[PDB]
Amino acid sequence: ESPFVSNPGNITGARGLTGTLRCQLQVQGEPPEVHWLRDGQILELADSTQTQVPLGEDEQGDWIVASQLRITSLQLSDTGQYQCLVFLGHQTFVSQPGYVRLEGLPYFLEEPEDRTVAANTPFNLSCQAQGPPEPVDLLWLQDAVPLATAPGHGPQRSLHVPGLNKTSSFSCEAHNAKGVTTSRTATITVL
Amino acid sequence: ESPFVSNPGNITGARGLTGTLRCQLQVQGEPPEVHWLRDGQILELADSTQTQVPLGEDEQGDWIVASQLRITSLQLSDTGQYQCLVFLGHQTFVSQPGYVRLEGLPYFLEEPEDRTVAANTPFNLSCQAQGPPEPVDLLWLQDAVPLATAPGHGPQRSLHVPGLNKTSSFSCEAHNAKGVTTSRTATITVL
Amino acid sequence: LPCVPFSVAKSVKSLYLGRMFSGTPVIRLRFKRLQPTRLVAEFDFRTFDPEGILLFAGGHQDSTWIVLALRAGRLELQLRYNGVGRVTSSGPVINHGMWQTISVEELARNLVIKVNRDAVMKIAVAGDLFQPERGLYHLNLTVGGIPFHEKDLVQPINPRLDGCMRSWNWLNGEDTTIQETVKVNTRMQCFSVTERGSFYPGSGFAFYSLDYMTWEVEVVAHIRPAADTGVLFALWAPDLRAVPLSVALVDYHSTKKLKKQLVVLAVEHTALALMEIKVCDGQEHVVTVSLRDGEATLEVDGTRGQSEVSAAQLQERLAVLERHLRSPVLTFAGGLPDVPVTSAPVTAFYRGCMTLEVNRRLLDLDEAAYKHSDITAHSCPPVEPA
Amino acid sequence: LPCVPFSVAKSVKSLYLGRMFSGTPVIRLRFKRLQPTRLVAEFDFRTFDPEGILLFAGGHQDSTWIVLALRAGRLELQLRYNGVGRVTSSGPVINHGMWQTISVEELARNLVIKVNRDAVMKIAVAGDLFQPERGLYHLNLTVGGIPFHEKDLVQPINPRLDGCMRSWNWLNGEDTTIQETVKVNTRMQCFSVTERGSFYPGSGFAFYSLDYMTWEVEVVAHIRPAADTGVLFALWAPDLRAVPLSVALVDKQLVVLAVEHTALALMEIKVCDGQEHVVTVSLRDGEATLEVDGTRGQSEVSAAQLQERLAVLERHLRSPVLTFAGGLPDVPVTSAPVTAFYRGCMTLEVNRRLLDLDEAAYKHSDITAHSCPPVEP
Ligand SMILES: *[C@@H]1O[C@H](CO)[C@@H](O[C@@H]2O[C@H](CO)[C@@H](O)[C@H](O)[C@H]2NC(C)=O)[C@H](O)[C@H]1NC(C)=O
Ligand SMILES: *[C@@H]1O[C@H](CO)[C@@H](O[C@@H]2O[C@H](CO)[C@@H](O)[C@H](O)[C@H]2NC(C)=O)[C@H](O)[C@H]1NC(C)=O
Ligand SMILES: [Ca+2]
Ligand SMILES: [Ca+2]
Ligand SMILES: [Cl-]
Ligand code: NI
Ligand code: NI
């Protein structure tokens, strides 16, 4: 057994989320500096707050040290295994790993674009969305009515219209396990 | 009968402060709109929020109706006498007044300026600050050495230096009832 | 005085949404702002109701606004943005009876709805809910219902929401007013603890306009009573004053642990079956009745009795039922109106938790024609343990 | 077993700054930030101690920092900024025994200090408390003391502060860690309720070294005892092991002024009622007078003994003597009438000068310098 008394939790959530990890420990006599490790490597430029509290009358008595790492905007590069590191004399202790994963609503890579057409004439609209998590099921709408019964059925990435005879609109919903994001509303102008 | 259940409180404070005033009341039937008065004038452009809570299942039953005026950044043009106003039929009702006034640490109108002078040359520095609260006592410092026993009972407003030989520095403290504010430190470079 | 006591504990720091059967909002806020302003609304929420309106925000009926609602136990957002209706439904289950944080915001060129700080809907929108008028920016907000008629939503819904709300934060205001007036009006507070059911406190009843026409009358009552007497389910001919069918609790028996209760299946004034039951032991029970010409059976926790009528009597009652049912009839739940005690054995109000399936269809008290106000539609308080 | 119970019930969500007589900070925070970052610190605070150190924020000893402190019951801010020091005091009286909000923040090119969300000090400053080093910005922050020696403050101060902190916000952090470790360390929680005075739980003593020089020994003790016997005040000679003078309680319930084992006066008190009694003494060759609540007690000596007991006392005062409060070291029980530790609330003036337990040569940790708990009804 080691000097760590609690281990970094996890933080999993969407891009831009701010969260913290913290490990705390107990040492004897003036405390060591606690470093953080992304994937077993020192983090050199990271928002952290160490908190030291002595338990005896003196600075020579036991101490409760505790570092908190701050991620302000959870971008994808922040992903992976985190753990604390303390050098105690001529010996190296490390905490249990915490994980930061990143997951959230779908994200559109393609959305239906406005178009103008003579119609009744064929045309196609696109709609692509990604996670994580996967898969992401698509659902089309024409004049804000769904066309199909649940995400996943029926038309998905490409929507073919035999052709309309009157200006209409078309939205796209993207569902995954976290929830739904809805696309711009394309307007298809007809002459 | 005067419908007001509670009249406006006060907000006495310093510039930049944000505060509210609220007045609530109880009325039979659909609740009227409540207007805020400063010094007898209805405020036509103010942050306000009206809350309305019905007390029966009926909307023709009683209602509790609050309003809170928000002052996002307190300043002198806000200083004055506030009260709520409502119309019930062709009869009007005014709340008891509440009061907003500015009060805090001294504000600097003029602080000691940087200068450059030859040795043993007479020159003058200035320091002007105002309340409220009045009076405002001043106290000069040369190289961080107070020029008098205590604030006010020293040299004030304008300081006459007979001349220097080394470069020196000058500050000036404004003390009033609420506390102290200290000027920028003025450097006087000598040649 | 009741054989089983239920908890009366309320939560001073809470807002009850289902207070008014009319569907009127339990709070109406009105915002005027100097700077342009994005809507933000957070609050904690807890319900079993699978359908109703959480809040409305925006302006005039047909103009531009949002309504956050529940439908099939999941969040539903409706929008009008210049005459373009649109509705989105998604996210996890909400009506699980457990507190959770819901939030709505105008973040960017989108609406974002979160459950427990974790986004469940991003709806693309171009436009602001706050509307300029007279050098200021206006927005109206209303909780637990809309300011306009439910037919003029993008999607009709039954706004009536038996749900509880706490720790609210409307546009980061610091107006402790709702909170205050809730303290002084216990009608506006919810049960500290809730459990699945519908509580009949026994001061009123509810009724429906149900058809039974060949004909069935099937009823399953899941009950956990407080009192030993009262009407579970009944039919009313408004014109004749009559009570074509009733299912009720009664008692008088004769040992220490005063048993003592019976369930009574009954046409008009004469019983058809009687079955002993132990309602006053805090356990749930299943009374269940199945009629159709020729047949009439009363089960209690999966147990039939055999009738109180010869079979000749049975037909000369079911023909009287058949008759009543050809005309329109009201389906009562939890009591009857004031009537002669000669027209039906029990006329009393029911006291306690009860659920009712009628003809294989689950009754929803929010859907009732009338529903007395103290009857909570989708939550029961728990049993007091002394 | 106490005759008067004192309501020693602590407060779990609080932080006692006076814990360590060493002056070691009760908390030390080390900040490392990626963006340039500006100091904000808010907390609620309550005390009767008129002197002490609330917090320190900055870097190296002679680099650039601030210290928020109490002197003569008022706020005082010391800044060093690039080796130039300045001290500033203003604002209302703070040590009135009532909770207030206090806050330090960097605002524009100023430092702003507020009591109850209302500003009492606005100090002009050139530059920032946070500082660059290896591509990050760094700041240290300590509570209840500084991380260097009181010597090297802009103006020296006795940092020991019998005060109570709660609802703290250090840089808008959310690190429930101080709060947790206070929960499991009752030595770090302060009395839920405080009253004026200094409390002795009977577990130890404090001592000073005071000159009594011709000579005199005036001692006034504002006592509210929790126990019928105990040493309030005493002198003591390290070499000869003697107790040249002592003032104690004993039972069935009376005060005693003594030299060595012989008592020079006696005077009764009903100490277990819970009222403030004023025990007062005066000594000087020829004279020895013990009063209590204004009333004098008659002596246990002729006058021929009194002169040849005062003769011994003055021989002891030409040597060095430790003045003790609230107890005595282990001594032969034949060396003084009472030797057990005092329990209760007490305030001592010696020679028309008030004793500050923070100014002692030694103080047992459980003695609280400027607060007593209330008596329990
Ligand atoms: C906000 O709601 C208020 C009601 O609380 C609206 O006031 C009504 O508006 C109609 C027009 O739509 C007026 O003719 C009525 O006189 C008002 N009725 C009452 C009872 O005051 C108000 O228009 C709404 N404002 C916005 C921006 O939506
Ligand atoms: C903040 O305080 C810490 C100690 O808690 C300082 O750390 C010491 O700094 C000196 C000078 O760099 C080193 O030689 C010591 O070995 C350090 N000790 C530890 C445990 O790290 C730190 O320098 C201070 N920093 C600031 C900006 O005040
Ligand atoms: Ca409902
Ligand atoms: Ca002190
Ligand atoms: Cl909870
Ligand atoms: Ni499917
Ligand atoms: Ni003066």
Side-chain angles (χ1 to χ4, degrees), chain D residues 221-258:
Chain D
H222 275 51
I223 54 168
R224 179 171 289 201
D228 48 29
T229 103
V231 177
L232 313 176
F233 174 86
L235 311 184
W236 188 70
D239 305 279
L240 279 160
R241 307 297 316 277
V243 181
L245 174 57
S246 34
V247 179
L249 313 175
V250 246
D251 79 308
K252 293 169 183 279
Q253 291 172 116
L254 64 132
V255 184
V256 44
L257 190 176

Short mmCIF file of all heavy atoms in Angstrom, two decimals, chain D residues 221-258:
data_model
loop_
_atom_site.label_atom_id
_atom_site.label_comp_id
_atom_site.label_asym_id
_atom_site.label_seq_id
_atom_site.Cartn_x
_atom_site.Cartn_y
_atom_site.Cartn_z
N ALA D 221 -8.22 38.91 38.15
CA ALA D 221 -8.70 37.74 37.41
C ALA D 221 -10.22 37.77 37.26
O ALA D 221 -10.95 37.64 38.23
CB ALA D 221 -8.26 36.47 38.12
N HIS D 222 -10.67 37.95 36.02
CA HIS D 222 -12.09 37.90 35.70
C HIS D 222 -12.45 36.46 35.37
O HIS D 222 -12.38 36.05 34.22
CB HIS D 222 -12.41 38.86 34.54
CG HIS D 222 -12.66 40.27 34.98
ND1 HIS D 222 -11.79 40.95 35.80
CD2 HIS D 222 -13.68 41.12 34.72
CE1 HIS D 222 -12.27 42.16 36.03
NE2 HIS D 222 -13.42 42.29 35.39
N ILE D 223 -12.82 35.71 36.40
CA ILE D 223 -13.00 34.26 36.27
C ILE D 223 -14.47 33.88 36.20
O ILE D 223 -15.30 34.48 36.86
CB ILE D 223 -12.33 33.47 37.42
CG1 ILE D 223 -12.80 33.95 38.80
CG2 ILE D 223 -10.82 33.55 37.33
CD1 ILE D 223 -12.40 33.03 39.94
N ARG D 224 -14.76 32.87 35.38
CA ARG D 224 -16.06 32.20 35.35
C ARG D 224 -15.74 30.70 35.32
O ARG D 224 -15.65 30.10 34.25
CB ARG D 224 -16.85 32.62 34.11
CG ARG D 224 -18.20 31.95 33.97
CD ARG D 224 -19.02 32.59 32.85
NE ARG D 224 -19.49 33.92 33.22
CZ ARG D 224 -20.52 34.56 32.67
NH1 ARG D 224 -21.22 34.00 31.69
NH2 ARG D 224 -20.85 35.77 33.10
N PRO D 225 -15.53 30.11 36.51
CA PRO D 225 -15.01 28.74 36.61
C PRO D 225 -15.99 27.64 36.20
O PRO D 225 -17.20 27.80 36.35
CB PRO D 225 -14.67 28.59 38.10
CG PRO D 225 -14.58 29.99 38.62
CD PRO D 225 -15.60 30.75 37.83
N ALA D 226 -15.43 26.54 35.72
CA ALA D 226 -16.17 25.32 35.44
C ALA D 226 -15.86 24.23 36.48
O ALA D 226 -16.39 23.11 36.39
CB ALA D 226 -15.83 24.81 34.04
N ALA D 227 -15.00 24.54 37.44
CA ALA D 227 -14.56 23.55 38.42
C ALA D 227 -14.13 24.24 39.71
O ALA D 227 -13.46 25.27 39.68
CB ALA D 227 -13.44 22.71 37.85
N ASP D 228 -14.51 23.64 40.84
CA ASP D 228 -14.35 24.29 42.14
C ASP D 228 -12.90 24.49 42.61
O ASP D 228 -12.67 25.32 43.49
CB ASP D 228 -15.18 23.58 43.23
CG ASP D 228 -15.00 22.07 43.24
OD1 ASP D 228 -13.92 21.58 42.85
OD2 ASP D 228 -15.95 21.36 43.64
N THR D 229 -11.95 23.74 42.05
CA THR D 229 -10.51 23.94 42.37
C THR D 229 -9.64 24.09 41.12
O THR D 229 -9.88 23.45 40.09
CB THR D 229 -9.90 22.81 43.26
OG1 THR D 229 -9.10 21.92 42.46
CG2 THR D 229 -10.97 22.01 44.03
N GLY D 230 -8.62 24.94 41.22
CA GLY D 230 -7.64 25.12 40.16
C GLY D 230 -6.78 26.35 40.35
O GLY D 230 -7.21 27.33 40.93
N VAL D 231 -5.56 26.29 39.84
CA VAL D 231 -4.61 27.41 39.91
C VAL D 231 -4.95 28.42 38.83
O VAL D 231 -4.91 28.11 37.64
CB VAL D 231 -3.17 26.92 39.67
CG1 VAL D 231 -2.19 28.10 39.67
CG2 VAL D 231 -2.78 25.89 40.72
N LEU D 232 -5.27 29.65 39.24
CA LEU D 232 -5.56 30.72 38.30
C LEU D 232 -4.25 31.33 37.83
O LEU D 232 -4.01 31.45 36.63
CB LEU D 232 -6.42 31.80 38.96
CG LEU D 232 -7.64 31.38 39.78
CD1 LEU D 232 -8.31 32.58 40.44
CD2 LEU D 232 -8.63 30.61 38.92
N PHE D 233 -3.41 31.70 38.79
CA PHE D 233 -2.20 32.49 38.58
C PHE D 233 -1.13 31.94 39.52
O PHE D 233 -1.44 31.48 40.61
CB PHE D 233 -2.50 33.95 38.93
CG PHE D 233 -1.30 34.86 38.90
CD1 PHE D 233 -0.89 35.46 37.72
CD2 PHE D 233 -0.61 35.16 40.06
CE1 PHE D 233 0.20 36.32 37.69
CE2 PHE D 233 0.49 36.01 40.04
CZ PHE D 233 0.89 36.59 38.85
N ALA D 234 0.13 31.98 39.09
CA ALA D 234 1.23 31.50 39.92
C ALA D 234 2.59 31.91 39.39
O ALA D 234 2.79 31.99 38.19
CB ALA D 234 1.18 29.98 40.05
N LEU D 235 3.51 32.16 40.30
CA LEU D 235 4.90 32.36 39.95
C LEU D 235 5.59 31.05 40.24
O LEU D 235 5.07 30.23 41.00
CB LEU D 235 5.49 33.48 40.78
CG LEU D 235 4.64 34.75 40.79
CD1 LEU D 235 5.34 35.87 41.55
CD2 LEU D 235 4.31 35.19 39.37
N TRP D 236 6.76 30.83 39.63
CA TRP D 236 7.48 29.57 39.80
C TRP D 236 8.96 29.73 39.49
O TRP D 236 9.32 30.39 38.51
CB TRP D 236 6.86 28.50 38.91
CG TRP D 236 7.41 27.13 39.15
CD1 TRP D 236 7.21 26.35 40.25
CD2 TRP D 236 8.23 26.37 38.27
NE1 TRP D 236 7.87 25.16 40.11
CE2 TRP D 236 8.51 25.14 38.90
CE3 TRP D 236 8.77 26.61 37.00
CZ2 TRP D 236 9.30 24.16 38.31
CZ3 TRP D 236 9.56 25.63 36.41
CH2 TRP D 236 9.81 24.42 37.06
N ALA D 237 9.80 29.14 40.34
CA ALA D 237 11.25 29.23 40.22
C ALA D 237 11.80 27.90 39.71
O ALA D 237 11.73 26.90 40.42
CB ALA D 237 11.87 29.57 41.57
N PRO D 238 12.34 27.88 38.48
CA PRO D 238 12.82 26.64 37.84
C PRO D 238 13.86 25.85 38.65
O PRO D 238 13.84 24.62 38.63
CB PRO D 238 13.48 27.14 36.56
CG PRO D 238 12.85 28.46 36.29
CD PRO D 238 12.56 29.06 37.62
N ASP D 239 14.74 26.56 39.34
CA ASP D 239 15.88 25.94 40.00
C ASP D 239 15.49 25.38 41.36
O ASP D 239 15.76 24.22 41.65
CB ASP D 239 17.02 26.95 40.16
CG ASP D 239 17.42 27.58 38.84
OD1 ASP D 239 18.20 26.95 38.08
OD2 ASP D 239 16.96 28.71 38.55
N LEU D 240 14.86 26.22 42.17
CA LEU D 240 14.48 25.84 43.53
C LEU D 240 13.15 25.08 43.61
O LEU D 240 12.74 24.66 44.70
CB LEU D 240 14.44 27.08 44.43
CG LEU D 240 15.80 27.55 44.97
CD1 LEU D 240 15.74 29.00 45.42
CD2 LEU D 240 16.28 26.66 46.11
N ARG D 241 12.47 24.90 42.48
CA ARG D 241 11.20 24.17 42.40
C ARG D 241 10.05 24.80 43.22
O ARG D 241 8.99 24.19 43.37
CB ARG D 241 11.38 22.71 42.83
CG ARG D 241 12.47 21.93 42.10
CD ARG D 241 12.21 21.80 40.61
NE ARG D 241 10.83 21.43 40.28
CZ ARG D 241 10.33 20.19 40.29
NH1 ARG D 241 11.08 19.14 40.62
NH2 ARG D 241 9.06 19.99 39.97
N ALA D 242 10.26 26.02 43.73
CA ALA D 242 9.30 26.64 44.65
C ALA D 242 8.24 27.43 43.90
O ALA D 242 8.42 27.81 42.74
CB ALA D 242 10.03 27.53 45.64
N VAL D 243 7.12 27.67 44.58
CA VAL D 243 5.99 28.43 44.06
C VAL D 243 5.87 29.70 44.92
O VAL D 243 4.98 29.79 45.78
CB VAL D 243 4.69 27.60 44.13
CG1 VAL D 243 3.51 28.37 43.56
CG2 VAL D 243 4.85 26.28 43.39
N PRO D 244 6.77 30.68 44.71
CA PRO D 244 6.80 31.88 45.54
C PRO D 244 5.44 32.53 45.75
O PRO D 244 5.26 33.22 46.75
CB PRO D 244 7.72 32.84 44.77
CG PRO D 244 8.23 32.10 43.59
CD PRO D 244 7.89 30.66 43.74
N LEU D 245 4.51 32.34 44.83
CA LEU D 245 3.18 32.93 44.94
C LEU D 245 2.18 32.13 44.13
O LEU D 245 2.51 31.58 43.09
CB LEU D 245 3.22 34.39 44.46
CG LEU D 245 1.92 35.19 44.36
CD1 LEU D 245 1.16 35.23 45.68
CD2 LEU D 245 2.22 36.61 43.90
N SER D 246 0.95 32.04 44.63
CA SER D 246 -0.11 31.28 43.98
C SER D 246 -1.46 31.85 44.36
O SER D 246 -1.65 32.38 45.44
CB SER D 246 -0.03 29.81 44.38
OG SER D 246 0.42 29.65 45.72
N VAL D 247 -2.40 31.73 43.43
CA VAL D 247 -3.78 32.16 43.65
C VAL D 247 -4.66 31.08 43.02
O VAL D 247 -4.66 30.90 41.80
CB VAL D 247 -4.07 33.53 43.01
CG1 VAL D 247 -5.52 33.94 43.22
CG2 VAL D 247 -3.15 34.60 43.58
N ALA D 248 -5.39 30.35 43.87
CA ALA D 248 -6.14 29.18 43.43
C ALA D 248 -7.58 29.17 43.94
O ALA D 248 -8.00 30.08 44.65
CB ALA D 248 -5.44 27.93 43.90
N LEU D 249 -8.32 28.15 43.53
CA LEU D 249 -9.61 27.81 44.12
C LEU D 249 -9.47 26.45 44.80
O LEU D 249 -8.62 25.64 44.39
CB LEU D 249 -10.68 27.71 43.03
CG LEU D 249 -10.77 28.82 41.99
CD1 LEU D 249 -11.83 28.46 40.95
CD2 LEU D 249 -11.11 30.14 42.65
N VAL D 250 -10.29 26.20 45.83
CA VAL D 250 -10.39 24.87 46.47
C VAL D 250 -11.78 24.60 47.06
O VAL D 250 -12.60 25.51 47.14
CB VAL D 250 -9.34 24.63 47.59
CG1 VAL D 250 -8.37 23.53 47.18
CG2 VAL D 250 -8.62 25.91 47.97
N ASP D 251 -12.02 23.35 47.46
CA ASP D 251 -13.24 22.98 48.19
C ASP D 251 -12.93 21.99 49.31
O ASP D 251 -13.31 22.22 50.46
CB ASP D 251 -14.31 22.42 47.25
CG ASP D 251 -14.06 20.96 46.86
OD1 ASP D 251 -12.94 20.64 46.41
OD2 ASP D 251 -15.00 20.14 47.01
N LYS D 252 -15.39 24.20 51.44
CA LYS D 252 -16.22 23.87 50.29
C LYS D 252 -16.51 25.11 49.41
O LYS D 252 -17.63 25.63 49.41
CB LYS D 252 -17.54 23.20 50.74
CG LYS D 252 -17.38 21.82 51.37
CD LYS D 252 -18.68 21.37 52.01
CE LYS D 252 -18.55 20.03 52.71
NZ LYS D 252 -18.63 18.89 51.76
N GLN D 253 -15.46 25.58 48.72
CA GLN D 253 -15.50 26.60 47.65
C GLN D 253 -14.99 27.97 48.09
O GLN D 253 -15.76 28.83 48.49
CB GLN D 253 -16.87 26.75 46.98
CG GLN D 253 -17.27 25.54 46.16
CD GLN D 253 -18.69 25.64 45.67
OE1 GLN D 253 -18.95 25.71 44.47
NE2 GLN D 253 -19.64 25.68 46.61
N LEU D 254 -13.67 28.15 47.99
CA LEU D 254 -13.05 29.43 48.34
C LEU D 254 -11.72 29.72 47.63
O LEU D 254 -11.00 28.81 47.22
CB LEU D 254 -12.86 29.54 49.87
CG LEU D 254 -11.92 28.56 50.59
CD1 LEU D 254 -10.99 29.32 51.52
CD2 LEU D 254 -12.71 27.51 51.36
N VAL D 255 -11.43 31.01 47.51
CA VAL D 255 -10.20 31.52 46.92
C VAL D 255 -9.10 31.57 47.97
O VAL D 255 -9.38 31.69 49.16
CB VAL D 255 -10.40 32.95 46.38
CG1 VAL D 255 -9.14 33.45 45.68
CG2 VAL D 255 -11.58 32.99 45.42
N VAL D 256 -7.85 31.47 47.53
CA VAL D 256 -6.71 31.47 48.44
C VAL D 256 -5.53 32.15 47.77
O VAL D 256 -5.21 31.85 46.63
CB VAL D 256 -6.31 30.03 48.85
CG1 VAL D 256 -6.29 29.10 47.64
CG2 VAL D 256 -4.95 30.03 49.54
N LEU D 257 -4.92 33.08 48.50
CA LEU D 257 -3.67 33.71 48.09
C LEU D 257 -2.59 33.13 48.98
O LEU D 257 -2.69 33.19 50.20
CB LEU D 257 -3.75 35.23 48.28
CG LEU D 257 -2.63 36.12 47.71
CD1 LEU D 257 -3.00 37.58 47.94
CD2 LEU D 257 -1.27 35.81 48.31
N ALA D 258 -1.54 32.58 48.37
CA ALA D 258 -0.52 31.89 49.13
C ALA D 258 0.89 32.21 48.65
O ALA D 258 1.10 32.53 47.50
CB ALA D 258 -0.76 30.39 49.05
#
